[PDB]
């Protein structure tokens, strides 16, 4: 009648109150970090389940238009102003 979570623990690692305050976002990821992030995607990878999922995948990939239709989607004239 004893829960597995209650009992003796290894006290080598002290209780970390918080995580790192600032990560090295500017530093680019190494090949190992990139490759490890690709394996985390694989665990959740499944085949498309229905038609709605196919449309969602294409939308995220950029293959399918985003609705409601905007006829200037992806085109800006270098962010120029009307006065220019």
């Amino acid at each position: 009648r004893k829960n597995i979570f209650t009992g003796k623990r290894l006290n080598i690692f002290d209780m970390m109150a918080v995580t790192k305050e600032a990560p090295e976002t500017d530093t680019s990821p190494s090949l190992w970090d990139v490759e490890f992030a690709k394996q985390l995607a694989t665990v959740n990878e499944q085949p498309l389940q229905n038609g709605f999922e196919e449309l969602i995948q294409w939308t995220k990939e950029g293959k399918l238009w985003e609705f409601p239709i905007n006829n200037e989607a992806g085109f800006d004239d270098d962010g120029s102003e009307f006065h220019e």
Partner: peptide
Amino acid sequence: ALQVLREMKAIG
């Protein structure tokens, strides 16, 4: 192994 699990939960 259970001790390792209990340590994880304590650390966070």
